[PDB]
Amino acid sequence: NKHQIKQAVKKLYDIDVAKVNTLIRPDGEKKAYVRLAPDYDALDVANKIGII
Amino acid sequence: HKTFRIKRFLAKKQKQNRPIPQWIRMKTGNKIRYNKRRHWRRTKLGL
Amino acid sequence: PFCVILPEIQKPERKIQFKEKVLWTAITLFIFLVCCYWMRVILASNRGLMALGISPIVTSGLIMQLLAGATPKDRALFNGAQKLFGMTITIGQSIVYVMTVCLLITIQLFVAGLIVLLLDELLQKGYGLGSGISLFIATNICETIVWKAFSPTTVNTGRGMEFEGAIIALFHLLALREAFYRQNLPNLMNLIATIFVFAVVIYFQGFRVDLPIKSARYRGQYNTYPIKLFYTSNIPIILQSALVSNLYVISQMLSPVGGLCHYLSPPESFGSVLEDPVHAVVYIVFMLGSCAFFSKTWIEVSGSSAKDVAKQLKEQQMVMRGHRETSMVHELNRYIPTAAAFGGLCIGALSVLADFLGAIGSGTGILLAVTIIYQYFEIFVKEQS
Amino acid sequence: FVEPSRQFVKDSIRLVKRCTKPDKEFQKIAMATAIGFAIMGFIGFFVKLIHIPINN
């Protein structure tokens, strides 16, 4: 759920989360849009993770 | 308007509607030549 | 209308084993090296009838191609037009030698008129050791490899015996002063620094951003489009900075290590030289900036920008995993433009590190050598399963 | 106004983070490349040591 996803993202990537939206894709996977805090650049964080 | 169970059934039925990988045709004892394909109009799901 | 009276030459159209190319195409350069602007020598050659013959032969091809681009009728004008400039280029260096009875010396050029013209077309077919870069690597590595063999074969002494070599001279010195003066034949110390340059460059050579790519029709295997960190062949980048350095020097000489204008000059000293940093630090700043400037502009003209790469991939029917065709460019733009700017900066910085450390080959030029020998390495590995 | 400079270096940093580099993998990849470079240099040394015996 959104609480668990937010906590997991915070712990794994050492960042702050503004909010989390979730959907369940028509292939059965759950997709989460994690909006980060304004003081965090999602582009730099994505580069740290490996994407983009 | 769907339930979670119906949607999961539909997702599984969607993930099964793909062609066989081509490299499976190269195996030593392969008898398959193509895929149990389902079309939304030609055959209806068990619902 | 007067150019349709010259025929052309034929070429083979059959598979050729690699052994023939590696054994036969790598030889016959000794005739040009029978005799083996001293700073300017690094451009093509050293002797001023032998001349160079590296730049003119490819220059003729460049001229003919640009004239074509400025069809069987034009095709017949390709191999025939090189002979028009073949005599001009040969006499061009000789007349330069004359300016800076001497007419009798022109008989020596009779043999040299056609020595390299025949080899120009033949070497291209086969393995792929063409574009004159095979000549450059052979001579550039030669000054590095035969440098060791020079010491046993050197006859000149100067002040200490050298006919018997200098690497092992325990009888001559011993006590023994292993820390001798490396002002001539630095063979003992420069090899220590140069191997460091070889190791660092190859490490930065393997840097690349791997972009996921798939066929637009088949589900299955995923391939990666490699965008190298340099992303530009070393010759396009380093030559554009080498040519301007040579052009600067020849201009000042016509109009600098001694008795010459010293406004702009590369630092050169054992260890470190520092009297006014306003000269040393400026040199690297102009060297780094020019390299990135040259590398960034090359992709805009060589058809290797992000826009052109996507057109190549669209032609080959390759797509990103979850992006449209139009989003190919944007993902390429994430890495391609900055790789050329930073890759050119890095390769320029490697030259500064190579020059400052005083490696074999005076630092510059070895970057060209290490890259090209790597360039044919990818051929070598893929041809061996 | 110096912001593009601050941009460029940052982008460079990202490239280095995005670029695949030999990490254990350093040993394997660097050793393979160094062996290839060494054998190619040995071939170059061998091919360019033929005209010397003319003077001895």
Side-chain angles (χ1 to χ4, degrees), chain A residues 20-45:
Chain A
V20 182
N21 290 26
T22 49
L23 51 87
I24 296 176
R25 287 142 49 93
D27 81 316
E29 307 296 339
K30 180 172 284 183
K31 180 201 309 181
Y33 307 95
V34 174
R35 176 182 180 84
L36 307 173
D39 42 316
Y40 278 111
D41 182 24
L43 194 43
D44 297 329
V45 180

PDB file of all heavy atoms in Angstrom, chain A residues 20-45:
ATOM      1  N   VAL A  20       2.329   9.593  -2.951  1.00  0.00           N
ATOM      2  CA  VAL A  20       2.363   8.379  -3.761  1.00  0.00           C
ATOM      3  C   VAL A  20       0.982   8.138  -4.354  1.00  0.00           C
ATOM      4  O   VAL A  20      -0.012   8.088  -3.624  1.00  0.00           O
ATOM      5  CB  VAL A  20       2.806   7.149  -2.945  1.00  0.00           C
ATOM      6  CG1 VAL A  20       2.873   5.921  -3.837  1.00  0.00           C
ATOM      7  CG2 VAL A  20       4.142   7.394  -2.280  1.00  0.00           C
ATOM      8  N   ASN A  21       0.922   7.983  -5.674  1.00  0.00           N
ATOM      9  CA  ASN A  21      -0.267   7.514  -6.370  1.00  0.00           C
ATOM     10  C   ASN A  21      -0.002   6.109  -6.887  1.00  0.00           C
ATOM     11  O   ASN A  21       1.126   5.783  -7.257  1.00  0.00           O
ATOM     12  CB  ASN A  21      -0.636   8.435  -7.536  1.00  0.00           C
ATOM     13  CG  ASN A  21      -1.156   9.777  -7.079  1.00  0.00           C
ATOM     14  OD1 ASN A  21      -0.836  10.241  -5.989  1.00  0.00           O
ATOM     15  ND2 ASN A  21      -1.968  10.406  -7.910  1.00  0.00           N
ATOM     16  N   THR A  22      -1.026   5.267  -6.896  1.00  0.00           N
ATOM     17  CA  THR A  22      -0.851   3.891  -7.330  1.00  0.00           C
ATOM     18  C   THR A  22      -1.967   3.483  -8.279  1.00  0.00           C
ATOM     19  O   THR A  22      -3.110   3.926  -8.153  1.00  0.00           O
ATOM     20  CB  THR A  22      -0.806   2.913  -6.143  1.00  0.00           C
ATOM     21  OG1 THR A  22      -1.906   3.167  -5.264  1.00  0.00           O
ATOM     22  CG2 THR A  22       0.487   3.055  -5.373  1.00  0.00           C
ATOM     23  N   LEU A  23      -1.615   2.629  -9.234  1.00  0.00           N
ATOM     24  CA  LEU A  23      -2.597   1.955 -10.066  1.00  0.00           C
ATOM     25  C   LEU A  23      -2.171   0.505 -10.224  1.00  0.00           C
ATOM     26  O   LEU A  23      -1.023   0.146  -9.969  1.00  0.00           O
ATOM     27  CB  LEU A  23      -2.762   2.637 -11.434  1.00  0.00           C
ATOM     28  CG  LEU A  23      -1.546   2.945 -12.309  1.00  0.00           C
ATOM     29  CD1 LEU A  23      -1.187   1.773 -13.196  1.00  0.00           C
ATOM     30  CD2 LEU A  23      -1.820   4.171 -13.146  1.00  0.00           C
ATOM     31  N   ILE A  24      -3.115  -0.336 -10.622  1.00  0.00           N
ATOM     32  CA  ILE A  24      -2.827  -1.721 -10.970  1.00  0.00           C
ATOM     33  C   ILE A  24      -2.984  -1.854 -12.476  1.00  0.00           C
ATOM     34  O   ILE A  24      -4.084  -1.679 -13.014  1.00  0.00           O
ATOM     35  CB  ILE A  24      -3.730  -2.700 -10.206  1.00  0.00           C
ATOM     36  CG1 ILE A  24      -3.434  -2.604  -8.709  1.00  0.00           C
ATOM     37  CG2 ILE A  24      -3.512  -4.118 -10.696  1.00  0.00           C
ATOM     38  CD1 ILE A  24      -4.323  -3.442  -7.846  1.00  0.00           C
ATOM     39  N   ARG A  25      -1.879  -2.149 -13.154  1.00  0.00           N
ATOM     40  CA  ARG A  25      -1.853  -2.180 -14.604  1.00  0.00           C
ATOM     41  C   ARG A  25      -2.702  -3.330 -15.137  1.00  0.00           C
ATOM     42  O   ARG A  25      -2.942  -4.313 -14.436  1.00  0.00           O
ATOM     43  CB  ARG A  25      -0.415  -2.314 -15.096  1.00  0.00           C
ATOM     44  CG  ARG A  25       0.418  -1.056 -14.938  1.00  0.00           C
ATOM     45  CD  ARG A  25       1.843  -1.386 -14.542  1.00  0.00           C
ATOM     46  NE  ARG A  25       2.431  -2.413 -15.391  1.00  0.00           N
ATOM     47  CZ  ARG A  25       3.144  -2.167 -16.480  1.00  0.00           C
ATOM     48  NH1 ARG A  25       3.364  -0.934 -16.897  1.00  0.00           N
ATOM     49  NH2 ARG A  25       3.654  -3.186 -17.165  1.00  0.00           N
ATOM     50  N   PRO A  26      -3.181  -3.224 -16.381  1.00  0.00           N
ATOM     51  CA  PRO A  26      -3.985  -4.311 -16.957  1.00  0.00           C
ATOM     52  C   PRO A  26      -3.220  -5.609 -17.168  1.00  0.00           C
ATOM     53  O   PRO A  26      -3.837  -6.610 -17.543  1.00  0.00           O
ATOM     54  CB  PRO A  26      -4.467  -3.720 -18.291  1.00  0.00           C
ATOM     55  CG  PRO A  26      -3.528  -2.621 -18.592  1.00  0.00           C
ATOM     56  CD  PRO A  26      -3.116  -2.055 -17.274  1.00  0.00           C
ATOM     57  N   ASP A  27      -1.908  -5.635 -16.942  1.00  0.00           N
ATOM     58  CA  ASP A  27      -1.144  -6.874 -16.927  1.00  0.00           C
ATOM     59  C   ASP A  27      -0.958  -7.424 -15.518  1.00  0.00           C
ATOM     60  O   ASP A  27      -0.274  -8.437 -15.343  1.00  0.00           O
ATOM     61  CB  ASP A  27       0.218  -6.672 -17.594  1.00  0.00           C
ATOM     62  CG  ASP A  27       1.237  -6.042 -16.669  1.00  0.00           C
ATOM     63  OD1 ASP A  27       0.891  -5.074 -15.965  1.00  0.00           O
ATOM     64  OD2 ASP A  27       2.389  -6.521 -16.648  1.00  0.00           O
ATOM     65  N   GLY A  28      -1.548  -6.778 -14.512  1.00  0.00           N
ATOM     66  CA  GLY A  28      -1.522  -7.269 -13.154  1.00  0.00           C
ATOM     67  C   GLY A  28      -0.457  -6.670 -12.261  1.00  0.00           C
ATOM     68  O   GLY A  28      -0.519  -6.863 -11.041  1.00  0.00           O
ATOM     69  N   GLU A  29       0.514  -5.958 -12.818  1.00  0.00           N
ATOM     70  CA  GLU A  29       1.521  -5.308 -11.998  1.00  0.00           C
ATOM     71  C   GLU A  29       0.971  -4.020 -11.402  1.00  0.00           C
ATOM     72  O   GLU A  29       0.095  -3.368 -11.977  1.00  0.00           O
ATOM     73  CB  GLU A  29       2.775  -5.003 -12.818  1.00  0.00           C
ATOM     74  CG  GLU A  29       3.351  -6.193 -13.552  1.00  0.00           C
ATOM     75  CD  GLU A  29       3.849  -7.284 -12.625  1.00  0.00           C
ATOM     76  OE1 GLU A  29       4.131  -6.994 -11.445  1.00  0.00           O
ATOM     77  OE2 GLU A  29       3.957  -8.441 -13.083  1.00  0.00           O
ATOM     78  N   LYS A  30       1.489  -3.658 -10.235  1.00  0.00           N
ATOM     79  CA  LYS A  30       1.147  -2.388  -9.616  1.00  0.00           C
ATOM     80  C   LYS A  30       2.215  -1.358  -9.955  1.00  0.00           C
ATOM     81  O   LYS A  30       3.408  -1.603  -9.769  1.00  0.00           O
ATOM     82  CB  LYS A  30       1.000  -2.527  -8.101  1.00  0.00           C
ATOM     83  CG  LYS A  30       0.645  -1.222  -7.413  1.00  0.00           C
ATOM     84  CD  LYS A  30       0.309  -1.420  -5.952  1.00  0.00           C
ATOM     85  CE  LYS A  30      -1.071  -2.019  -5.781  1.00  0.00           C
ATOM     86  NZ  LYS A  30      -1.444  -2.150  -4.354  1.00  0.00           N
ATOM     87  N   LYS A  31       1.777  -0.217 -10.469  1.00  0.00           N
ATOM     88  CA  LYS A  31       2.646   0.895 -10.812  1.00  0.00           C
ATOM     89  C   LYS A  31       2.436   2.008  -9.797  1.00  0.00           C
ATOM     90  O   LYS A  31       1.292   2.353  -9.475  1.00  0.00           O
ATOM     91  CB  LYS A  31       2.350   1.387 -12.230  1.00  0.00           C
ATOM     92  CG  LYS A  31       3.193   2.549 -12.697  1.00  0.00           C
ATOM     93  CD  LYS A  31       2.518   3.267 -13.846  1.00  0.00           C
ATOM     94  CE  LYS A  31       2.109   2.310 -14.945  1.00  0.00           C
ATOM     95  NZ  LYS A  31       1.476   3.012 -16.089  1.00  0.00           N
ATOM     96  N   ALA A  32       3.532   2.556  -9.284  1.00  0.00           N
ATOM     97  CA  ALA A  32       3.489   3.640  -8.315  1.00  0.00           C
ATOM     98  C   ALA A  32       4.188   4.868  -8.879  1.00  0.00           C
ATOM     99  O   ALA A  32       5.323   4.781  -9.357  1.00  0.00           O
ATOM    100  CB  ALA A  32       4.138   3.227  -6.993  1.00  0.00           C
ATOM    101  N   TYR A  33       3.494   6.003  -8.831  1.00  0.00           N
ATOM    102  CA  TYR A  33       4.071   7.314  -9.089  1.00  0.00           C
ATOM    103  C   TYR A  33       4.400   7.944  -7.743  1.00  0.00           C
ATOM    104  O   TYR A  33       3.497   8.314  -6.988  1.00  0.00           O
ATOM    105  CB  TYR A  33       3.105   8.205  -9.860  1.00  0.00           C
ATOM    106  CG  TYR A  33       2.559   7.622 -11.133  1.00  0.00           C
ATOM    107  CD1 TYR A  33       1.343   6.962 -11.150  1.00  0.00           C
ATOM    108  CD2 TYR A  33       3.244   7.757 -12.328  1.00  0.00           C
ATOM    109  CE1 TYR A  33       0.833   6.440 -12.316  1.00  0.00           C
ATOM    110  CE2 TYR A  33       2.742   7.239 -13.495  1.00  0.00           C
ATOM    111  CZ  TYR A  33       1.536   6.584 -13.484  1.00  0.00           C
ATOM    112  OH  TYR A  33       1.034   6.067 -14.648  1.00  0.00           O
ATOM    113  N   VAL A  34       5.685   8.069  -7.444  1.00  0.00           N
ATOM    114  CA  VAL A  34       6.153   8.656  -6.199  1.00  0.00           C
ATOM    115  C   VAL A  34       6.610  10.073  -6.508  1.00  0.00           C
ATOM    116  O   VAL A  34       7.670  10.274  -7.109  1.00  0.00           O
ATOM    117  CB  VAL A  34       7.286   7.832  -5.575  1.00  0.00           C
ATOM    118  CG1 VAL A  34       7.835   8.540  -4.369  1.00  0.00           C
ATOM    119  CG2 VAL A  34       6.795   6.447  -5.210  1.00  0.00           C
ATOM    120  N   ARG A  35       5.803  11.054  -6.121  1.00  0.00           N
ATOM    121  CA  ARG A  35       6.215  12.447  -6.195  1.00  0.00           C
ATOM    122  C   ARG A  35       7.113  12.753  -5.006  1.00  0.00           C
ATOM    123  O   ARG A  35       6.707  12.570  -3.852  1.00  0.00           O
ATOM    124  CB  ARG A  35       4.999  13.366  -6.204  1.00  0.00           C
ATOM    125  CG  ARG A  35       5.335  14.840  -6.187  1.00  0.00           C
ATOM    126  CD  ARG A  35       4.065  15.655  -6.147  1.00  0.00           C
ATOM    127  NE  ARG A  35       4.306  17.092  -6.119  1.00  0.00           N
ATOM    128  CZ  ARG A  35       4.523  17.835  -7.194  1.00  0.00           C
ATOM    129  NH1 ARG A  35       4.594  17.299  -8.400  1.00  0.00           N
ATOM    130  NH2 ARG A  35       4.676  19.148  -7.055  1.00  0.00           N
ATOM    131  N   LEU A  36       8.324  13.219  -5.295  1.00  0.00           N
ATOM    132  CA  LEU A  36       9.324  13.525  -4.290  1.00  0.00           C
ATOM    133  C   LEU A  36       9.103  14.919  -3.714  1.00  0.00           C
ATOM    134  O   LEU A  36       8.316  15.721  -4.223  1.00  0.00           O
ATOM    135  CB  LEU A  36      10.728  13.426  -4.882  1.00  0.00           C
ATOM    136  CG  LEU A  36      11.072  12.115  -5.587  1.00  0.00           C
ATOM    137  CD1 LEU A  36      12.420  12.220  -6.262  1.00  0.00           C
ATOM    138  CD2 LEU A  36      11.049  10.958  -4.605  1.00  0.00           C
ATOM    139  N   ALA A  37       9.825  15.203  -2.637  1.00  0.00           N
ATOM    140  CA  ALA A  37       9.750  16.508  -2.013  1.00  0.00           C
ATOM    141  C   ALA A  37      10.332  17.572  -2.943  1.00  0.00           C
ATOM    142  O   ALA A  37      11.207  17.280  -3.760  1.00  0.00           O
ATOM    143  CB  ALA A  37      10.497  16.500  -0.686  1.00  0.00           C
ATOM    144  N   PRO A  38       9.856  18.817  -2.840  1.00  0.00           N
ATOM    145  CA  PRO A  38      10.369  19.870  -3.732  1.00  0.00           C
ATOM    146  C   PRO A  38      11.868  20.084  -3.630  1.00  0.00           C
ATOM    147  O   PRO A  38      12.490  20.503  -4.614  1.00  0.00           O
ATOM    148  CB  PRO A  38       9.589  21.115  -3.286  1.00  0.00           C
ATOM    149  CG  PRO A  38       9.054  20.780  -1.929  1.00  0.00           C
ATOM    150  CD  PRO A  38       8.781  19.315  -1.969  1.00  0.00           C
ATOM    151  N   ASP A  39      12.469  19.812  -2.474  1.00  0.00           N
ATOM    152  CA  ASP A  39      13.905  19.976  -2.295  1.00  0.00           C
ATOM    153  C   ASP A  39      14.714  18.804  -2.837  1.00  0.00           C
ATOM    154  O   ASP A  39      15.914  18.719  -2.557  1.00  0.00           O
ATOM    155  CB  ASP A  39      14.227  20.189  -0.814  1.00  0.00           C
ATOM    156  CG  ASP A  39      13.433  19.274   0.093  1.00  0.00           C
ATOM    157  OD1 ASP A  39      12.215  19.125  -0.134  1.00  0.00           O
ATOM    158  OD2 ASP A  39      14.024  18.705   1.034  1.00  0.00           O
ATOM    159  N   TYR A  40      14.096  17.903  -3.596  1.00  0.00           N
ATOM    160  CA  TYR A  40      14.791  16.784  -4.218  1.00  0.00           C
ATOM    161  C   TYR A  40      14.535  16.803  -5.716  1.00  0.00           C
ATOM    162  O   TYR A  40      13.391  16.961  -6.149  1.00  0.00           O
ATOM    163  CB  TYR A  40      14.342  15.447  -3.626  1.00  0.00           C
ATOM    164  CG  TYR A  40      15.030  15.086  -2.334  1.00  0.00           C
ATOM    165  CD1 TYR A  40      14.335  15.076  -1.134  1.00  0.00           C
ATOM    166  CD2 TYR A  40      16.372  14.742  -2.316  1.00  0.00           C
ATOM    167  CE1 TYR A  40      14.961  14.739   0.046  1.00  0.00           C
ATOM    168  CE2 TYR A  40      17.006  14.406  -1.139  1.00  0.00           C
ATOM    169  CZ  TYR A  40      16.296  14.406   0.037  1.00  0.00           C
ATOM    170  OH  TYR A  40      16.926  14.070   1.210  1.00  0.00           O
ATOM    171  N   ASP A  41      15.596  16.638  -6.501  1.00  0.00           N
ATOM    172  CA  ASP A  41      15.487  16.597  -7.955  1.00  0.00           C
ATOM    173  C   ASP A  41      15.348  15.144  -8.392  1.00  0.00           C
ATOM    174  O   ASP A  41      16.284  14.353  -8.244  1.00  0.00           O
ATOM    175  CB  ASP A  41      16.701  17.247  -8.610  1.00  0.00           C
ATOM    176  CG  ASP A  41      16.597  17.277 -10.118  1.00  0.00           C
ATOM    177  OD1 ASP A  41      15.462  17.232 -10.635  1.00  0.00           O
ATOM    178  OD2 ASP A  41      17.647  17.332 -10.790  1.00  0.00           O
ATOM    179  N   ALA A  42      14.184  14.799  -8.944  1.00  0.00           N
ATOM    180  CA  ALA A  42      13.944  13.432  -9.385  1.00  0.00           C
ATOM    181  C   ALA A  42      14.902  13.001 -10.483  1.00  0.00           C
ATOM    182  O   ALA A  42      15.162  11.804 -10.621  1.00  0.00           O
ATOM    183  CB  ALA A  42      12.503  13.276  -9.866  1.00  0.00           C
ATOM    184  N   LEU A  43      15.433  13.943 -11.263  1.00  0.00           N
ATOM    185  CA  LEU A  43      16.370  13.587 -12.324  1.00  0.00           C
ATOM    186  C   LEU A  43      17.695  13.098 -11.747  1.00  0.00           C
ATOM    187  O   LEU A  43      18.223  12.062 -12.170  1.00  0.00           O
ATOM    188  CB  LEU A  43      16.579  14.787 -13.245  1.00  0.00           C
ATOM    189  CG  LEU A  43      17.253  14.573 -14.597  1.00  0.00           C
ATOM    190  CD1 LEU A  43      16.723  13.325 -15.278  1.00  0.00           C
ATOM    191  CD2 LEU A  43      17.022  15.795 -15.471  1.00  0.00           C
ATOM    192  N   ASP A  44      18.236  13.824 -10.767  1.00  0.00           N
ATOM    193  CA  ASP A  44      19.469  13.394 -10.113  1.00  0.00           C
ATOM    194  C   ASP A  44      19.278  12.070  -9.389  1.00  0.00           C
ATOM    195  O   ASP A  44      20.146  11.190  -9.444  1.00  0.00           O
ATOM    196  CB  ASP A  44      19.945  14.467  -9.136  1.00  0.00           C
ATOM    197  CG  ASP A  44      20.306  15.765  -9.825  1.00  0.00           C
ATOM    198  OD1 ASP A  44      20.762  15.718 -10.986  1.00  0.00           O
ATOM    199  OD2 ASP A  44      20.137  16.835  -9.203  1.00  0.00           O
ATOM    200  N   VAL A  45      18.146  11.913  -8.703  1.00  0.00           N
ATOM    201  CA  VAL A  45      17.859  10.668  -7.998  1.00  0.00           C
ATOM    202  C   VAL A  45      17.744   9.511  -8.979  1.00  0.00           C
ATOM    203  O   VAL A  45      18.248   8.411  -8.726  1.00  0.00           O
ATOM    204  CB  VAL A  45      16.584  10.828  -7.157  1.00  0.00           C
ATOM    205  CG1 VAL A  45      16.275   9.545  -6.411  1.00  0.00           C
ATOM    206  CG2 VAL A  45      16.754  11.983  -6.201  1.00  0.00           C
TER     207      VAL A  45
END
